[PDB]
Amino acid sequence: RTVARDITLLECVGKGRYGEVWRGSWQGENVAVKIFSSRDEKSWFRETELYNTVMLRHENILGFIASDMTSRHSSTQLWLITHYHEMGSLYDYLQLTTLDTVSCLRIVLSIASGLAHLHIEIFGGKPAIAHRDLKSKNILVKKNGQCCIADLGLAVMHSQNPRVGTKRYMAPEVLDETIQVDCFDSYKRVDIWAFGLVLWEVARRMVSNGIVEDYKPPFYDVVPNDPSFEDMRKVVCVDQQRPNIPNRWFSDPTLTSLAKLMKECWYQNPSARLTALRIKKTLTKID
Ligand SMILES: COc1cc(-c2cncc(-c3ccc(C4CCN(C)CC4)cc3)c2C)cc(OC)c1OC
Ligand SMILES: COc1cc(-c2cncc(-c3ccc(C4CCN(C)CC4)cc3)c2C)cc(OC)c1OC
Numbered sequence: 417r418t419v420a421r422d423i424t425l426l427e428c429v430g431k432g433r434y435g436e437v438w439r440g441s442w443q444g445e446n447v448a449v450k451i452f453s454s455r456d457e458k459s460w461f462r463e464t465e466l467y468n469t470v471m472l473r474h475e476n477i478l479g480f481i482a483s484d485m486t487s488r489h490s491s492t493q494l495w496l497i498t499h500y501h502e503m504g505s506l507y508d509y510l511q512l513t514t515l516d517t518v519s520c521l522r523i524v525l526s527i528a529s530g531l532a533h534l535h536i537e538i539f540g541g542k543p544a545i546a547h548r549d550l551k552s553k554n555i556l557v558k559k560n561g562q563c564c565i566a567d568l569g570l571a572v573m574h575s576q577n578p579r580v581g582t583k584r585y586m587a588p589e590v591l592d593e594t595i596q597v598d599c600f601d602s603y604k605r606v607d608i609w610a611f612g613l614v615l616w617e618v619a620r621r622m623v624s625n626g627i628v629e630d631y632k633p634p635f636y637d638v639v640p641n642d643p644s645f646e647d648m649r650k651v652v653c654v655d656q657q658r659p660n661i662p663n664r665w666f667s668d669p670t671l672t673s674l675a676k677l678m679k680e681c682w683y684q685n686p687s688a689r690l691t692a693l694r695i696k697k698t699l700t701k702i703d
């Protein structure tokens with residue numbers, strides 16, 4: 417039995433503090449290879465521990481292929497190998513692309529579907545999982561118009577890293593340090609907040625009556641680039657600001673319904689927020 421492990425790294429499609437992602441080739445097929453920085457080894461360990469616990473398989477979860485640790489002279493090399501989505505991240509896609517009603521709904525319902533799959537405990541199955549870093553850069557666009565959720569490096573599991581989430585997307589109870597850290601439902605409610613921000617980013621790019629908004633990240637109008645923890649706490653907790661809903665949305669039945677959904681993801685009180693399952697149901701009754 418020959419075990420062909422060679423992956424050809426062809427082009428770098430992302431670089432950050434986390435490390436790099438490459439388009440690679442295995443046996444003639446594209447794969448995505450995440451090479452971790454020493455800085456973020458704990459993200460590789462957590463994603464690997466999760467997949468060693470439960471082999472997630474869902475059309476709206478980035479598909480796992482392999483976790484590799486390789487001994488080097490003076491270091492350990494850590495790779496995560498996944499399915500490759502050539503259209504790139506939702507963040508990337510929304511910069512130039514506008515959406516119609518069908519494509520907007522298909523994107524956001526596919527995300528809700530992936531998120532509900534993470535959140536739900538299945539007996540027999542899977543533990544319940546909270547993501548803890550949901551954002552448009554951690555969502556990939558598939559050729560079929562659905563998305564998938566990536567990066568379980570901060571995920572938490574329930575049955576019975578010093579990395580923290582992206583500050584721009586942190587829920588109020590994270591910023592004001594009131595989150596009940598011993599309560600699994602707390603982490604689901606943090607994901608729902610972040611989902612609502614992603615819903616807003618997508619809805620802005622849906623055309624209605626010949627109008628569309630430019631791509632902006634959540635809170636673009638009230639915080640700097642690379643906002644501090646304090647910048648975010650003042651906006652979200654002290655002033656209790658929420659992203660703007662443009663007037664033009666209220667002429668479109670889809671965007672009107674999506675604005676109501678966003679509102680119900682953004683309550684200050686975490687336990688008032690909708691569940692991923694209720695978001696899916698609401699999205700299936702829109703249009
Ligand atoms: C170790 O490393 C890597 C391996 C591979 C890879 C390459 N060919 C064949 C395999 C294979 C799968 C499954 C079995 C089964 C069948 C027989 N029996 C009932 C249980 C065992 C055997 C062999 C693998 C796993 C790819 C890699 O990258 C994509 C690897 O590195 C990350
Ligand atoms: C890691 O990833 C990929 C792996 C492979 C791959 C390569 N050799 C052998 C296998 C295999 C054969 C047989 C069994 C089972 C089936 C019967 N059962 C009762 C026990 C044994 C499992 C595994 C696979 C799956 C192909 C891939 O792509 C086409 C992979 O994806 C990149």
Ligand SMILES: COc1cc(-c2cncc(-c3ccc(C4CCN(C)CC4)cc3)c2C)cc(OC)c1OC
Pocket residue numbers: 429430437448449450496497498499500501502503504505508553554555556566567568
């Ligand atoms: C978020 O997280 C992970 C993501 C991925 C991943 C999987 N498919 C495709 C991509 C990708 C491809 C291409 C572009 C751009 C670059 C060129 N041009 C400007 C248009 C297209 C962007 C993105 C990625 C980054 C893999 C991961 O692990 C292996 C990730 O980490 C879990």
